[PDB]
Amino acid sequence: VPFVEDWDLVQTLGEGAYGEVQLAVNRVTEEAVAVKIVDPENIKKEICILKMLNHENVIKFYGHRREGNIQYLFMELASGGSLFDRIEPDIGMPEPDAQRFFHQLMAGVVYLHGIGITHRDIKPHNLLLDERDNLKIADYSLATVFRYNNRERLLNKMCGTLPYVAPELLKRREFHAEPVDVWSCGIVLTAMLAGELPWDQPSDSCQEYSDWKEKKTYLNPWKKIDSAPLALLHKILVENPSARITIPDIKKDRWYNKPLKK
């Protein structure tokens, strides 16, 4: 069919130091996708991880064209935008909606950890929503391999977003990849349930993190979170990453399994 190769760029979806993301619409079919446009070794690594992804809760990669030294990355479009924009400041969202998002988050993180990929920047800006509000883990530009040939490799690179980062990345030289992504999913949950972030970073100098370590859940944001999800957060936001709840045990948590949503 002539012209099915052609896509019109119709809306800006995001701009950063990386380049931009454009909503693209096929000239013939009207299929809508997201095109990440960049102006070397890093994009090479990113494309390689992007090709490994095939799950309903992770953004799908359709392939890439280079024109000149400009790379175009075609991927699944999520027409409902980011989870960030469903969170009402100081309120959060309804507990059933939050639980449903957290289920989908866990499904995508399980998936990634299964294929030996860590995301390293899980936050509501990187969690996108399709036309039916299904959650898609986006942005693989910090993702890396933590398991290959069934052997684990420890991480040392400091990266992510401070209010989301686990405390071991601030205190230890090396750390396991999986407890880091689990912690950031906890902060996601807190945000959905409270419409606020609990601390600037999880350090001994941050009074809001000390308050948590001392159990002062009569303070915000914790006082806004019902006892059942707050139990779960007590098991996720544990400072020692070796004692921190794993995903298989999150799937056994009372709140996680509570029926809430129609």
Swiss-Prot record:
Expressed, tissue-wise, as follows: Expressed ubiquitously with the most abundant expression in thymus, testis, small intestine and colon.
Q: Does the keyword Transport apply?
A: no
What GO biological process, any one, is recorded here?
Answer: mitotic G2 DNA damage checkpoint signaling
Tell me where on the tree of life, at the top rank, the source sits.
Eukaryota
Post-translational modification comment from the UniProt entry: Phosphorylated by ATR in a RAD17-dependent manner in response to ultraviolet irradiation and inhibition of DNA replication. Phosphorylated by ATM in response to ionizing irradiation. Ubiquitinated. Mono or diubiquitination promotes nuclear exclusion. Ubiquitination and degradation are required to terminate the checkpoint and ensure that activated CHEK1 does not accumulate as cells progress through S phase, when replication forks encounter transient impediments during normal DNA replication. 'Lys-63'-mediated ubiquitination by TRAF4 at Lys-123 activates cell cycle arrest and activation of DNA repair.
Impact when changing residue 36 to R: Abolishes kinase activity
Q: Can you locate the Glycyl lysine isopeptide (Lys-Gly) (interchain with G-Cter in ubiquitin) cross-link?
A: 123
- Name a single GO cellular component: extracellular space
One GO term in the molecular function aspect is:
histone H3T11 kinase activity
Enzyme type, top EC level = transferase
Chain spans, region Interaction with CLSPN: 1-256
Here the disulfide bonds are none
Which residues make up the binding site for ATP?
13-21, 36
Which compartments does it reside in? Nucleus; Chromosome; Cytoplasm; Cytoplasm, Cytoskeleton, Microtubule organizing center, Centrosome
Please summarize the record's notes on activators and inhibitors of this protein. Activated through phosphorylation predominantly by ATR but also by ATM in response to DNA damage or inhibition of DNA replication. Activation is modulated by several mediators including CLSPN, BRCA1 and FEM1B. Proteolytic cleavage at the C-terminus by SPRTN during normal DNA replication activates the protein kinase activity.
| Residues annotated as catalytic | 121 (proton acceptor)
Statement: the UniProt record of this protein carries the keyword Cell membrane:
no
What residues does the Protein kinase domain cover? 7-256
Q: What does this protein do?
A: Serine/threonine-protein kinase which is required for checkpoint-mediated cell cycle arrest and activation of DNA repair in response to the presence of DNA damage or unreplicated DNA. May also negatively regulate cell cycle progression during unperturbed cell cycles. This regulation is achieved by a number of mechanisms that together help to preserve the integrity of the genome. Recognizes the substrate consensus sequence [R-X-X-S/T]. Binds to and phosphorylates CDC25A, CDC25B and CDC25C.
Q: How does it assemble?
A: Interacts (phosphorylated by ATR) with RAD51. Interacts with and phosphorylates CLSPN, an adapter protein that regulates the ATR-dependent phosphorylation of CHEK1. Interacts with BRCA1. Interacts with and phosphorylates CDC25A, CDC25B and CDC25C. Interacts with FBXO6, which regulates CHEK1. Interacts with PPM1D, which regulates CHEK1 through dephosphorylation. Interacts with TIMELESS; DNA damage-dependent. Interacts with FEM1B; activates CHEK1 in response to stress. Interacts with TLK1. Interacts with XPO1 and YWHAZ. Interacts with CDK5RAP3; antagonizes CHEK1.
What is the associated disease? Oocyte/zygote/embryo maturation arrest 21: An autosomal dominant, female infertility disorder characterized by zygote development arrest due to failure of pronuclei fusion.
Q: Which family does it belong to?
A: Belongs to the protein kinase superfamily. CAMK Ser/Thr protein kinase family. NIM1 subfamily.
User: Which comment does the entry carry about domains?
Assistant: The autoinhibitory region (AIR) inhibits the activity of the kinase domain.
- In its UniProt entry, what is this protein called? Serine/threonine-protein kinase Chk1
Q: Which organism is it from?
A: Homo sapiens
For this protein's source organism, the top of the classification is:
Eukaryota, Metazoa, Chordata, Craniata, Vertebrata
Annotated gene: CHEK1
Q: Which residues of the full protein are shown?
A: 3 to 271 of 476
